Design a protein around this ligand. Structure first.
Ligand SMILES: Nc1ncnc2c1ncn2[C@@H]1O[C@H](COP(=O)(O)OP(=O)(O)OP(=O)(O)O)[C@@H](O)[C@H]1O
Ligand SMILES: Nc1ncnc2c1ncn2[C@@H]1O[C@H](COP(=O)(O)OP(=O)(O)OP(=O)(O)O)[C@@H](O)[C@H]1O
Ligand SMILES: Nc1ncnc2c1ncn2[C@@H]1O[C@H](COP(=O)(O)OP(=O)(O)O)[C@@H](O)[C@H]1O
Ligand SMILES: [Mg+2]
Ligand SMILES: [Mg+2]
Lengths: 889, 384, 227, 394
């Protein structure tokens, strides 16, 4: 310990502040010149951020704190310069002069007067001087003042601009990663009124930098994936003009303001569609922005590009509508027939091979329900132009044999044979349509609504399925003619045929298998307005569901189209609109949780989760509302699909340990559909945790719950090595797990993963995380599998063709005007980069590099080389124009 | 445990805020999906009850068996400790994987069914041939060479520490490194500083101890040696004095020079096999570079050939300054007279003269070393 | 209380542990028991007094006083070569020094009954170092080319590669001009000590110490017998 | 601003990960147990079902049967020999003699036949896995690639052009030349391309300690080889497995010669390997025995020489395609400076020539960097050069 000798700072700043009450009165020169020699020496001796152990900042306040407490308040005649020498010296060490109750008394030194132009002694220093002190201001002082005292005195008025020049002081000194420290100031400052600080920093951000918008930009989109409802409401509309005013990157506008479409205002992204139709620059980014407006996240847009300039750029709309959809056809017409796919692969039933020699002999399984699964030897393999001529004979000779819903099934498989088609899908039905059969005609014409899905051209606004519907006095002519029109027009918001399908609800006909899927058909059309649909559902719900206490034909079908009619908003008005609408006995208050959480698909509002588990957790429920708790766990299946790769880990760490092992009914019977709505992504954290409850058949329960989780477990697309865990389970499934109720189900499980080698992107996360409907077409099946009385009769309308929004599979696409370039691509693991050094290292899977139409995969991001510069849209979106530029010799 | 590998950010980013609050989403939502288990069906504890149900399946007489084959439908032929093998079945708590032919397993006492697997206490030979700690000081101990230090850092250290320079170049490091010169020139002494420098697993073998007395035990020792070398990770294998396999004949080896030859065939495979080799660097040293097989010295098996010349006199004085650093040198001595004492003295000669001179001081209990200690020290060391 | 490499009592019905069986052997106590070296002392040294002082400087000092070499900043010696004709006191000297400084006098001979306590095959010689670092203040001794390669294989480990100290080697042989030049590297060997045949003075005292256990007759004139 | 507030919200939720994952049960780091959720198949049913009804059924070996009766003669590991009987679950057809069978401990009767012993050191030398070496990487010896590939895979991939012409294709080939010439690397393209069992054999792995021990490994090799339909057996460095027979005075080097003669007998005569193709690769062929060198065992005889000029230039284009270079360099000048050079030497010129660019501060090498590689690799290492007493193969 070497003390003494060089003690000038523990002596003369120990003497002259002690002689400062002895030199304030009756000594006018020593009051100000020793305060000047105290000010500039504490300034210059604390500007450097290498000597943080200053010789005054932790040394003078052993007596200079009590001297300051009798120096600034107890003087009472403070003039105009001695406050500039006093409050500029006494305000610097005060976050470390005081201990942790500084937060109520930052103001007894500073709010006397802010001395002049405070950044003058905060130019070189980064954060020791007054930026940590300013975080202490905006942490506590502006929170207590601006809790209900926003429009106020000096505590807000100068604090706006003091929160302006310090926020520019973050982008003034070094341009390090302390740039992203500024939305901490803009955020913790006025958390709910975020617009008043983003107006103070938006134009300063416009004059900030043109390269320092991108890490702050993704910094703001991450924050804008979810928040509290007002924070996500305000910070997302403040997110929008940053690539518009400062930057002109301007091509990620549509897919990243689908974020900002539903919660804020449905006309706001229509004004941003106007902002798409203003920047009329050219052809490339103009093409690529409106590529996604048809069949990548939304539809219902094809009446807004018929202005007075219809030559090619406003004649883009038909090419958006069907010709790049014909490029989605051209994928499988030209680019999948050359890679692997033959006309009849057929060999997954051939992959069911060696059970005749696995343990003796075979030729034993002769179950009649096996041919329901042998319908998909035709059906599931024939996606992506699997057209068959005299190879549909497994549906032809079974089409005329038995199984009336199998006559609906083999005739309904033809739409899965001809998918995304308008060219001949009406012609391939007509050779098997004419049979004078209620079940063949309604399944085949139900497949007519499947073929034109996404086309929405002139196929049948009131042409074919209206002619199918007007025949009705009976079975599926009445039923399977409203499903395909909602399926094909699921992307449309046309009101007229919605009012053609409104008397289907208002008929009050006793065909309840039709009246339940009527709500599932009209719910797929609109997600916003038209309260008359909701009135039409609830009036028949009162006329029918009230005077009965019976099965889930009502519960699985009628409020689900109301959830689809009020999907996607966190405003918590629709829960008041629909929860107080069906005030009733609790079996009609089954619909309390439908519209409440169906509006809450992707957000973070965990206060919804505590009111999603804490009202009805167990209560031991002696056979009263087990279905209402199955639906209460069904609405725990969102908050789970669109948060994107974040917090999904212990989604699986305990989703075997919460209900499926030692619940009562909700997990042993229902809650493995949390894995059936969560993902198809594919990872062993659930993929090796589910056969510990699936290979455990546990036959003491109603074992078709576990067999209901069998095919659903096999719900996962992007085909993998799961033929072990499913073909072994079907190998024991020959002897045990009786084929009298499961022969459709095990090969339904096996044939589901590898439908076709491709087209496996149905999982509601596009670009990075945006939705793309994907829920209106997927939800009523996982709601529909109440695990009974629909594996044989009623649910064969849904179990075939429920989800049909398959936006194909890959992103390897050139789309130059000639279509002569192939690519320069390099597929990798999902993005690592947030912020680091210079060109931030993007990701780490450099070993793969492609140039052609090849596969997508689950966690992949794809970049390039060759100085092509990929200048189109810069984030994601799978149809880059791919122009090139070579100003780099 | 391997929950989320996104640990990039390195500032106050909101991604870091929202991602850790979304781990708080998977943990708050699903800690409320942890509460309900023993609330609804207690029925056991499941922390020890099912565990003691396994432990009541398996008996306390746990016989230790050995695998030799696997049939997939949880039964296989396992070897007893006697030798009389059985055809027992395999349980469900056996985690069907850590099962290789030759693995130590746990069987029943009654029906000898495959209860468990056993962690292997390895073999002592790995601990024998494996260097544990850093031997000595750094490259600053060496002095005077300064050229091939860049060569050994070039071929070994720089590929390890900087995996960027070869990738911006589109190139791979050179494979084999060989060291040759007069004896006592610091050939092993460089590998000492390498074993200081690296963080990779380091193995060292003398070329004399390759040879054996039984037939094929040499090449088998080679095969398990490179097995041990590969089965870890990034590794450095050092071979000292590999001429001794070809120079000296011993009567312990039953096979003649055409057993040494076949050992050289096996090693000649193990340098450049068709197999995927891995991250195993090879550093070799000898003094009779002219004697051994040039088929092993070809580029592809050894890429870098490094000669060590004799120390020049200006480097000699540096080596004197090294080995006389921390000693109480009396000012009687003149090192320049000690330089030209031998015209071709090695670096070991300097250190030997220094240590023996210290021995001459400790014969007389002094603290400093005088000139006559060196005068009779060069007579003792050099002239005999 | 359960030690590795220890016997136990066991019950037979359930194979429950009963009681710890006392002890058995070290794998080195049996080894030197098989070898049976003639234990010696200073009190049976016949006239080798300067050689005693030479061997104390190499062996005795870096046990009792290792800091004394860090007072000079030099490394401690490791290897001893004893040479001269047979029958000159090499074995009793090397046994004696370890006996007085309390080290594990472990000679190696390359036999095969020694083999079973070192290992099952012991493909190297280096597996002895397991027992050697377990008896860490130890001294390895060697007789008069398998010894010559063996010593090099030891010295290559204890060149800086073995970190455990207090392990030193002694080779005893004759005719130094026919051994290895790599063993004649000047930095390799730390000290070589010659043992001459005894003169008339040193033939007398071995008769003196050796004459102790005999029942004599008064008046012998041992000087004439030594002459 | 929320500097500690992001840190403690990080750490309490990363800790609360452990605070509930200990409540799940993955803990109690075992001595060979399963994870505690994994095993629940054998929880209540198979605990008393795969244990209590189930036997041990100790496996045995059949000596022979007899006529008119089952009356089997069994054999076990150490114990005595019994007259045993079938079960009712199996036919007496595949209870053929010299066969392992599972046998109960009390009645001592046969339950199920077993596959024979493979001696798993012979199992380990099946490759199970393929390298990535393409025939494009073996450029410079294209006619040798064709003359080899017409023998290796063309009857295997097309067994109709030879049968319908009426010829039986050859089964044997040796590959020989100087070291580093691309023989082993050339075989890596074969193990890349092919599809059947690729069982590799290195000649220094068969040298055993006992007498005749290695010859039985040849036997088990060809026994598991004849079980398969088609197989490719690779031989490397066959000078270790045999040169010739030269024995004079005291018997020296006898043991390897018996394994070599066993390999001869397993190659020709007495209902041959059938569909088993062999492929040798050696360094010096002059040492080899002529009865081994007889066609019918070693039909194709591929030499690997040095390239003339253009194969060398192609090798420059192989190893120099994927490295940052000056654009306007020429490789033909480099090939004129290497009259006698192997492809590994050319690769060392390239890989050193990039290190010259790594020497000072350059991202792409130059022509003079190549010239700095040529004089060092070619002319400064020219003391060793490894070739000239192997051109004559001595
Ligand atoms: N250039 C040098 N500078 C300083 N000390 C050296 C030098 N060369 C050798 N020495 C010393 O001499 C001793 C012997 O050196 P080293 O073991 O490297 O010789 P070598 O050539 O490896 O012998 P061999 O390879 O035949 O065993 C080392 O302990 C080292 O301290
Ligand atoms: N024609 C060639 N083209 C490119 N590289 C070659 C060529 N010939 C040899 N090489 C290089 O030689 C190296 C080793 O080849 P290989 O192991 O096949 O030699 P070999 O002829 O089998 O002799 P040895 O049996 O001694 O190894 C390979 O890494 C390869 O890069
Ligand atoms: N100085 C001595 N005093 C007494 N006995 C000695 C002396 N030197 C040698 N001997 C005798 O020689 C024997 C030891 O021989 P020694 O030379 O140590 O073995 P080696 O011949 O293997 O070197 C002892 O039994 C001892 O009687
Ligand atoms: Mg050395
Ligand atoms: Mg080779």
């Amino acid at each position: 310990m070497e003390e003494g000798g060089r003690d000038k700072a523990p002596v003369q700043p120990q003497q002259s502040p002690a002689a400062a009450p002895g030199g304030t009165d009756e000594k006018p020169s020593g009051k100000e010149r020793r305060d000047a020699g105290d000010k500039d020496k504490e300034q210059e001796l604390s500007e450097e951020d290498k000597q943080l152990q200053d010789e005054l900042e932790m040394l003078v306040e052993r007596l200079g704190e009590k001297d300051t407490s009798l120096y600034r308040p107890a003087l009472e005649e403070l003039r105009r310069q001695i406050r500039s020498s006093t409050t500029s010296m006494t305000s610097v060490p005060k976050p470390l002069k005081f201990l942790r109750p500084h937060y109520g008394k930052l103001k007894e030194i500073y709010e006397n007067m802010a001395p002049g132009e405070n950044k003058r002694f905060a130019a070189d220093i980064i954060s020791v001087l007054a930026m940590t002190m300013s975080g202490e201001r905006e942490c506590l002082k502006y929170r207590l003042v601006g809790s209900q005292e926003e429009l106020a005195s000096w505590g807000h008025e100068y604090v706006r601009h003091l929160a302006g020049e310090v926020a520019k002081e973050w982008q003034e000194l070094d341009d390090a990663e302390k740039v992203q420290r500024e939305p901490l100031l803009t955020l913790v400052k006025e958390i709910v009124p975020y617009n008043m600080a983003h107006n103070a920093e938006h134009e300063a951000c416009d004059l900030l930098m043109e390269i320092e918008q991108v890490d702050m930009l993704e910094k703001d989109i991450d924050e804008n994936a979810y928040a509290k409802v007002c924070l996500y409401l305000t910070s997302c509309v403040n997110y929008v003009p940053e690539p518009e005013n400062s930057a002109l990157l301007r091509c990620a506008l549509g897919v990243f303001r689908k974020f900002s479409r539903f919660p804020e205002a449905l006309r706001l992204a229509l004004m941003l569609n106007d902002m798409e139709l203003v920047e009329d620059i050219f052809t490339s980014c103009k093409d690529v922005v409106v590529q996604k407006q048809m069949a990548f996240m939304l539809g219902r847009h094809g009446v807004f590009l018929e202005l007075s300039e219809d030559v090619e750029e406003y004649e883009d709309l038909t090419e958006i509508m069907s010709n790049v959809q014909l490029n989605s056809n051209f994928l499988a017409l030209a680019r999948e027939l050359d890679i692997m796919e033959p006309k009849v692969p057929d060999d997954i039933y051939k992959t069911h091979l060696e059970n005749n020699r696995f343990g003796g002999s075979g030729s034993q399984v002769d179950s009649a329900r096996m041919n329901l699964a042998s319908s998909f030897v035709n059906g599931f393999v024939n996606a992506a132009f699997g057209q068959d001529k005299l190879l549909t004979d497994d549906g032809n000779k079974w089409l005329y044999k038995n199984k009336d819903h199998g006559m609906l099934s083999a005739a309904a498989s033809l739409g899965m044979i001809l998918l995304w088609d308008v060219d001949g899908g009406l012609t391939q039905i007509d050779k098997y349509l004419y049979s004078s059969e209620d079940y063949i005609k309604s399944g085949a014409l139900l497949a007519c609504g499947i073929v034109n899905s996404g086309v929405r051209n002139e196929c049948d606004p009131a042409l074919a399925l209206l002619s199918d519907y007007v025949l009705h006095n009976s079975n599926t002519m009445r039923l399977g003619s409203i499903f395909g029109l909602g399926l094909a027009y699921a992307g449309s918001n046309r009101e007229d045929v919605l009012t053609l399908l409104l008397p289907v609800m208002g008929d009050s006909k006793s065909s309840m298998e039709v009246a339940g899927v009527t709500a599932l058909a009209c719910g797929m059309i609109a997600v916003g307005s038209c309260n008359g649909d909701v009135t039409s559902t609830i009036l028949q719900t009162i006329m029918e569901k009230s005077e009965t206490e019976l099965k889930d034909t009502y519960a699985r079908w009628l409020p689900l189209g109301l959830g689809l009619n009020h999907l996607g908003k966190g405003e918590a008005i629709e829960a008041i609109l629909a929860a107080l609408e069906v005030v009733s006995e609790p079996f009609r208050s089954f619909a309390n949780t439908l519209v409440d959480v169906c509006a809450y698909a992707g957000s973070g509002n965990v206060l919804k989760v505590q009111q999603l588990l804490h009202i009805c957790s167990e209560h031991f429920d002696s056979k009263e509302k087990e279905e209402d708790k199955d639906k209460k766990e069904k609405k725990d299946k969102d908050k789970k699909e669109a948060p994107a790769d974040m917090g999904a880990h212990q989604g699986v760490a305990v989703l075997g340990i919460a209900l499926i092992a030692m619940g009562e009914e909700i997990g042993a019977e229902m809650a493995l559909r949390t894995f059936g709505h969560l993902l198809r992504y594919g990872e062993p954290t659930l993929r090796r945790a589910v056969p510990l409850a699936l290979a455990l058949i546990s036959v003491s329960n109603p074992r078709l719950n576990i067999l209901d989780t069998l095919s659903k477990f096999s719900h996962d697309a992007d085909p993998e090595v799961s033929y072990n865990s499913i073909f072994a389970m079907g190998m024991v499934g020959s002897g045990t797990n009786n084929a009298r109720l499961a022969a459709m189900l095990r090969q339904l499980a096996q044939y589901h993963a590898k439908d076709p080698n491709n087209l496996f992107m149905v999982r509601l996360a596009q670009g990075l995380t945006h939705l793309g409907k994907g829920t209106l077409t997927l939800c009523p099946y996982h709601s529909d599998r109440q695990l009974m009385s629909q594996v044989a009769v009623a649910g064969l309308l849904t179990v075939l063709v429920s989800f049909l929004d398959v936006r194909n599979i890959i992103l390897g696409k050139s789309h130059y005007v000639l279509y002569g370039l192939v690519a320069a691509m390099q597929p990798r693991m999902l993005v690592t980069f947030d912020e680091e050094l210079r060109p931030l290292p993007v990701s780490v899977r450099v070993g793969q590099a492609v140039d052609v139409v090849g596969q997508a995969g689950k966690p992949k991001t794809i970049t390039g080389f060759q100085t092509h510069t990929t200048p189109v849209l810069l984030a994601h979106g799978e149809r880059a124009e791919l122009a090139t530029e070579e100003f780099l010799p | 445990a391997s929950k989320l590998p996104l640990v990039t950010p390195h500032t106050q980013c909101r991604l870091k805020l929202l991602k850790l609050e979304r781990i708080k989403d998977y943990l708050l939502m699903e800690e409320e999906f942890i509460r309900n288990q023993e609330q609804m069906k207690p029925l056991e504890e499941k922390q020890e009850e099912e565990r003691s149900k396994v432990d009541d399946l398996r008996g306390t007489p746990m016989s230790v068996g050995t695998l030799e084959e696997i049939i997939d439908d949880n039964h296989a032929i396992v070897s007893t400790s006697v030798g009389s093998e059985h055809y027992v079945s395999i349980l469900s708590f056996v985690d069907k994987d850590l099962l290789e032919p030759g693995c130590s397993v746990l069987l029943n006492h009654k029906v000898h069914a495959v209860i468990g697997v056993l962690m292997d206490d390895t073999d002592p030979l790995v601990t024998v041939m494996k260097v544990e700690k850093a031997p000595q000081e750094t490259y600053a101990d060496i002095g005077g060479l300064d050229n091939q230090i860049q060569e050994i850092k070039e071929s070994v250290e720089l590929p390890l520490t900087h995996p960027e320079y070869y990738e911006e170049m589109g190139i791979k490091p050179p494979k084999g490194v060989i060291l040759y010169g007069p004896p006592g020139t610091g050939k092993t002494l460089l590998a000492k500083a390498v074993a200081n420098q690296t963080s990779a697993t380091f193995l060292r073998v003398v070329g004399s101890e390759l040879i054996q007395k039984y037939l094929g035990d040499g090449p088998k020792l080679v095969r398990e040696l490179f097995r041990v070398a590969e089965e870890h990770a990034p590794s450095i294998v050092f071979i000292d004095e590999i001429d001794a396999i070809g120079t000296k004949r011993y009567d312990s080896n039953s096979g003649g020079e055409r057993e040494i030859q076949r050992t050289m065939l096996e090693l000649l495979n193990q340098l450049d096999g068709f197999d995927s080799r891995g991250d195993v660097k090879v550093i070799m040293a000898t003094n009779r570079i002219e004697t051994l097989d040039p088929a092993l010295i070809r580029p592809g098996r050894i890429d870098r050939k490094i000669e060590f010349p004799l120390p020049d006199e200006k480097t000699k004085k540096r080596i004197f300054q090294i080995h006389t650093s921390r000693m109480t040198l009396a000012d009687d001595v003149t090192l320049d007279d000690l330089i030209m004492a031998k015209d071709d003295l090695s670096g070991a000669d300097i250190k030997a003269i220094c240590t023996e001179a210290g021995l001459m001081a400790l014969r007389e209990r002094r603290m400093k070393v005088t000139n006559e200690d060196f005068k009779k020290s060069k007579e003792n060391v050099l002239y005999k | 209380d359960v030690t590795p490499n220890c016997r136990v009592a066991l019950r037979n019905d359930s194979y429950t542990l009963h009681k710890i069986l006392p002890n058995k052997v070290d794998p080195l106590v049996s080894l030197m028991m098989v070898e049976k070296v003639p234990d010696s002392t200073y009190e049976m040294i016949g006239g080798l007094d300067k050689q005693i002082k030479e061997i104390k400087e190499v062996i005795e000092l870096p046990v009792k006083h290792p800091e004394l070499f860090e007072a000079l900043g030099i490394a401690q010696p490791k290897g001893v070569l004893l040479y001269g004709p047979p029958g000159t006191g090499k074995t009793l000297l090397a046994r004696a020094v370890a006996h007085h400084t309390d080290c594990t006098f472990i000679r190696v001979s390359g036999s095969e009954l020694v083999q079973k306590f070192i290992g099952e095959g012991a493909r190297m010689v280096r597996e002895l170092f397991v027992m050697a670092r377990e008896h860490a203040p130890s001294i390895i001794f060697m007789d008069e080319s398998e010894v010559q390669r063996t010593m090099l294989e030891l010295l290559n480990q204890l060149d800086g590669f073995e970190a455990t100290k207090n392990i030193k080697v002694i080779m005893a042989t004759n005719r130094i001009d026919i051994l290895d030049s790599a063993l004649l590297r000047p930095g390799r060997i730390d000290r070589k000590i010659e043992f001459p045949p005894p003169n008339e003075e040193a033939r007398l005292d071995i008769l003196k110490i050796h004459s102790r256990k005999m029942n004599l007759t008064r008046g012998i004139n041992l000087r004439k017998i030594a002459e | 601003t929320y500097s500690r507030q992001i840190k403690q919200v990080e750490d309490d939720i990363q800790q609360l990960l452990k605070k509930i994952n200990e409540l799940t049960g993955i803990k109690e780091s075992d001595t060979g147990l399963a994870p505690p959720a994994l095993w629940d198949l054998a929880a209540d049913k198979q605990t008393l079902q795969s244990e209590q009804p189930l036997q041990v059924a100790r496996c045995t070996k059949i000596i022979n049967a007899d006529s008119e009766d089952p009356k089997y003669i069994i054999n076990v590991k150490q114990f005595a020999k019994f007259v045993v009987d079938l079960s009712d679950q199996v036919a007496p057809t595949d209870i053929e003699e010299g066969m392992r069978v599972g046998v109960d401990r009390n009645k001592y009767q046969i339950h199920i036949p077993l596959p024979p012993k493979i001696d798993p050191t012979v199992t380990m030398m099946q490759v199970e896995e393929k390298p990535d070496v393409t025939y494009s990487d073996v450029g410079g010896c294209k006619e040798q690639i064709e003359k080899l590939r017409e023998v290796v895979e063309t009857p295997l991939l097309h067994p109709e052009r030879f049968v319908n012409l009426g010829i039986e294709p050859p089964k044997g080939v040796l590959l020989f030349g100087p070291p580093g010439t691309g023989k082993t690397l050339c075989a890596r393209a074969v193990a890349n391309r092919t599809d059947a069992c690729f069982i590799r054999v290195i000649g220094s792995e068969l040298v055993q300690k006992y007498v005749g021990e290695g010859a039985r490994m040849v036997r088990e090799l060809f026994e598991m080889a004849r079980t398969k339909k088609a197989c490719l057996i690779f031989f490397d460095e066959i000078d270790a497995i045999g040169g010739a027979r030269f024995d004079d005075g005291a018997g020296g080097d006898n043991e390897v010669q018996r394994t070599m003669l066993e390999l001869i007998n397993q190659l020709d005569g007495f209902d041959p390997r059938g569909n088993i193709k062999v492929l040798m690769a050696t360094n010096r062929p002059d040492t080899l025995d002529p009865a081994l060198m007889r066609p019918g065992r070693l039909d194709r005889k591929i030499e690997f020489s040095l390239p003339d000029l253009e194969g060398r230039t192609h090798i420059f284009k192989i190893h120099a395609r994927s490295m940052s270079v000056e654009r306007d360099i020429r490789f033909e000048l480099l090939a004129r400076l290497c009259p006698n050079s192997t492809g590994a030497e050319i690769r060392s010129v390239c890989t050193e020539a990039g290190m010259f660019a790594i020497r000072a501060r350059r991202k792409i090498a130059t022509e003079k960097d190549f010239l700095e590689a040529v004089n060092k690799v070619i002319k400064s290492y020219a003391k060793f050069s490894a070739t000239p007493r192997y051109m004559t193969y001595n």
